[PDB]
Ligand SMILES: [Zn+2]
């Protein structure tokens with residue numbers, strides 16, 4: 062779980078930074094067990110499907 | 115005007131959460147929105163976007 066969060070959060074960092082450069086709001090947030098948007102973690106994590114989109 | 119409406123509805127919900135939290139013995143940590151500090155991304159620009167206000 063934690064490795065996959067790290068992996069996903071790296072992706073999120075990259076999207077936000079790109080959003081910033083393109084003059085859009087950078088609205089994405091990092092994942093944790095209490096708010097997670099990876100379907101395969103539902104149960105182990107709180108699946109919040111549209112957390113980041 | 116619609117900006118204000120969404121601050122009201124969000125603030126109502128902040129109120130409710132804070133009180134629930136107090137009731138269960140946890141601090142009232144949520145903070146109210148205004149045009150000068152707002153965490154609704156869609157408002158960004160018209161409001162001061164403070165992403166992690168809450
Ligand atoms: Zn997860």
Ligand SMILES: [Zn+2]
Pocket residue numbers: 117121148149152153154157160161162
């Ligand atoms: Zn606002």
